Structures are given as structure tokens and as C-alpha cells.
């Protein structure tokens with residue numbers, strides 16, 4: 479028997495501003511359904527406190543997608559609209575099973591391309607330095623596929639305990655704070671000026687696994703998004 483995330487108060491504010499995509503982008507449950515007790519192995523309250531996401535398969539997801547609050551439709555904002563767009567979370571990333579290679583846990587996405595992904599990564603070299611079992615940001619600065627279109631940053635090695643995140647977008651600039659420490663300040667987003675379809679996401683989006691059955695698993699102790 480699985481306990482629903484909505485059975486406690488902690489996540490109601492974000493559930494009131496999200497729909498859930500599972501197991502792919504086009505299959506969704508509404509904010510109303512989430513608030514009404516949506517539950518399953520993919521999305522349940524673990525140990526009385528964690529909004530836990532689980533998903534297997536290449537490019538499959540169990541992921542919240544930002545909505546206008548209070549039964550609203552899909553949100554679309556812009557990096558240069560003047561509003562500060564802020565997402566906060568506290569995440570326990572447990573040990574990922576063999577075959578899971580990258581799990582996107584927070585995003586800024588849009589109708590053109592992902593402006594930002596925060597992901598857990600098993601192993602990667604960045605700017606000449608090898609990192610293992612760590613949290614990375616990937617920012618798009620163009621629409622191409624080569625590495626020149628991205629800025630990738632080692633944010634923090636994965637920790638045993640909960641790790642806090644804050645993503646702030648204001649006036650075409652991005653700041654990321656992890657465990658209270660700034661890890662990216664003033665990253666340019668101006669390529670995306672005028673893109674009015676941006677939105678936050680969070681959960682588990684399974685990227686390039688080497689086994690289709692390996693289940694990615696991510697636990698949120700807190701999640702919120704706000705415009706201010």
C-alpha cells in the first residue's frame with residue numbers, strides 16, 4: 479500500500495502549480511488529480527516525507543511540469559520578462575542502480591529547447607577534470623547539438639543527505655545555489671530572450687541508460703516554484 483504525496487501538506491503548493499508527466503511527456507495527470515490523491519509506484523510518499531519519483535527506460539520520465547496555479551493552464555514565461563523566476567528544492571539522490579547513467583532532476587524547458595537541466599551523472603570529464611557520481615548543470619547557449627551549444631558545470635558531488643537547490647532567473651541571467659553555496663552566478667540566457675514558453679520541471683527524467691529496465695529513483699523533501 480502506497481501513501482499519496484498529497485496526504486501531507488508539504489507538497490500541496492507545488493502540486494497546485496504542476497501536472498505530472500508519466501511515463502512520457504505526452505501522458506499526463508492534472509494538478510487537480512495530483513491534489514486529489516494521485517499515487518503509484520512511480521510517484522508516492524516515501525518514509526512519510528519524500529515525494530519520490532521512479533522511472534525506467536530511455537528518455538522516459540516521471541516529472542512535474544509547471545502550471546499556472548489554481549487549476550490554470552500551462553505556464554510560459556521568458557528569461558527577459560523582468561520577473562524573477564525561482565525554483566527551490568531539497569533532494570535526496572539515493573544510489574542509482576546499474577544501467578542508470580544520467581537523471582535529470584530539475585529543468586527550465588520551453589517550446590524550443592531546454593534552457594537548463596540539473597542532472598545526476600554517473601561519470602564525466604568536464605574541462606579536463608574527471609568527476610563521478612555528481613550533480614551537473616547543462617545550460618544551452620544555442621540550438622545546435624555540438625558541445626559548443628552547452629555550458630556544463632560540476633555543481634556538487636552526490637551527498638548522502640538532502641541537498642538543497644535554488645534556481646533563479648532574472649533579466650536574462652541564471653544563478654544556481656546548492657546547499658546554500660553559489661555554484662553558477664550570472665550565466666547568460668540572452669540567446670533565449672523573447673522565448674515566452676519557458677517553464678520549470680522537476681522529478682526524474684532518465685537520460686541515456688544502458689539498461690531499459692533499470693529504474694531511476696529520486697526523492698524530494700521539498701519543491702516549490704514562484705514568480706516574484
Ligand SMILES: O=C(O)[C@H]1O[C@@H](O[C@H]2[C@H](O)[C@H](O)[C@H](O[C@H]3[C@H](O)[C@H](O)[C@@H](O)O[C@@H]3C(=O)O)O[C@@H]2C(=O)O)[C@@H](O)[C@@H](O)[C@@H]1O
Pocket residue numbers: 591592595616618623624625628630685686
Ligand atoms: O561531452 C559531452 O558534453 C557529451 O555531450 C553529449 O551530448 C549531449 C548534450 O550535450 C546535451 O546534454 C543533450 O541533452 C539532451 C537531454 O539528454 C535530453 O535528451 C533532453 O533534455 O534534450 C537535451 C538537449 O537537447 O539539450 O544530450 C546529449 C546527449 O547525447 O546526451 C554528446 O555530444 C556526447 O558525445 C558528449 O560526450
Ligand code: NA
Pocket residue numbers: 572
Ligand atoms: Na533512499
